Design a protein that fits this description.
This is Pectate lyase C. This protein is mainly beta and 352 residues long. It has four helices and 26 strands.
């Protein structure tokens, strides 16, 4: 079974011949992956020698709590993260209930990677690429049921005044198919890119059943390609939501928006506006803006906001299978399915 409910179709390390290992710290993860590259004779095998299912049981609450207490002290620290580079055998990193991490997971030139049930927050190194989850040149990645958090705040005197904290889920390069689902993302200024530059366009990404609260921007900052966002709960968006750029196409269906500024827009380039297809959201017409506290602002450069709340383009036939519940049901039920400690539970219409 490789159904993620989105463009990524992967089972990760849960394939045949998979080796299960328990990691009790960031260092164990690093060592476990390194050992997974050696064959029976001790020789390195390209892409990995065998599939892995790493159960992380470590807990770095102390680090997280200390950081939460002094958020402006984080950006200048050394970044901390486990790099999953060129590992294609299939790998799943799943956190044990109660586990926690003050380090990120950086996926690079790999494929078939699943990251589940990890609580990652307040990472050091916002000024030196300290991302929580990064997907670079990596197709078939599934980021599901995690809690990614920090503080939605910018400290004074940080480089570019944009480095207090890095991103939650940045996706770039040839990460052609990715599914980001059931994540509880909160207190994050820059949620996640979809293309690192104007020239970094493409990919097919699905964002479904995520609960975003108190986030400033990039849900995602899309550059070209296709994005399918369904059954997400968007609350307290302080900057802008889905920013569809460089002629990207997005299908936005059955989501719940509330207390949001510029929830669907195309700005910051002044040209090559992307398009969106809107359907089944709690918002159906502009009259609803007042009901759900949706505010719109302009930009210094030419932009397009969805203030008419109408579809501005088309969207290709959605390849995979999925059954969205109603926008009301996500608002009612989603917070109990998204995040860690939910036993990877999913929201079916039955539970609605």
């Amino acid at each position: 079974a490789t159904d993620t409910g989105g463009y990524a179709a992967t089972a990760g390390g849960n394939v045949t011949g998979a080796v299960s290992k328990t990691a009790t710290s960031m260092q164990d993860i690093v060592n476990i992956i390194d050992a997974a590259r050696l064959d029976a004779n001790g020789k390195k095998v390209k892409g990995g020698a065998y599939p892995l299912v790493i159960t992380y049981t470590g807990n770095e609450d102390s680090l997280i709590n200390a950081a939460a207490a002094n958020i402006c002290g984080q950006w200048s620290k050394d970044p901390r993260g486990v790099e999953i580079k060129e590992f294609t055998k299939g790998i799943t990193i799943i956190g044990a209930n109660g586990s926690s991490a003050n380090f990120g997971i950086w996926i690079k030139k790999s494929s078939d990677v699943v990251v589940q049930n990890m609580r990652i927050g307040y990472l050091p190194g916002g000024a030196k690429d300290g991302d929580m989850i990064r997907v670079d040149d990596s197709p078939n990645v599934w980021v599901d049921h995690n809690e990614l958090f920090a503080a939605n705040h910018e400290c004074d005197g940080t480089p570019d005044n944009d480095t207090t904290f890095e991103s939650a889920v940045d996706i770039k390069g040839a990460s052609n198919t990715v599914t980001v689902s059931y994540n509880y993302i909160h207190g994050v200024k820059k949620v996640g890119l979809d293309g690192s530059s104007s020239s970094d366009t493409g990919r097919n990404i699905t964002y479904h059943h995520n609960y975003y609260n108190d986030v400033n921007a990039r849900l995602p900052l899309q550059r070209g390609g296709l994005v399918h966002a369904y059954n997400n709960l968007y609350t307290n968006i302080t900057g802008s939501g889905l920013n569809v750029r460089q002629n990207g196409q997005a299908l936005i269906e059955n989501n719940w928006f509330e207390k949001a500024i510029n929830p669907v827009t195309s700005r910051y380039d002044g040209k090559n506006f992307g398009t969106w297809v809107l359907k089944g959201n709690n918002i159906t017409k502009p009259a609803d803006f007042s009901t759900y506290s949706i505010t719109w602002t302009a930009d210094t450069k030419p932009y397009v906001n969805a203030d008419s709340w109408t579809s501005t383009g088309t969207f290709p036939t959605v390849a995979y299978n999925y059954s969205p519940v109603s926008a009301q049901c996500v608002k009612d039920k989603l917070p109990g399915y998204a995040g860690v400690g939910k036993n990877l539970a999913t929201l079916t219409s039955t539970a609605c």
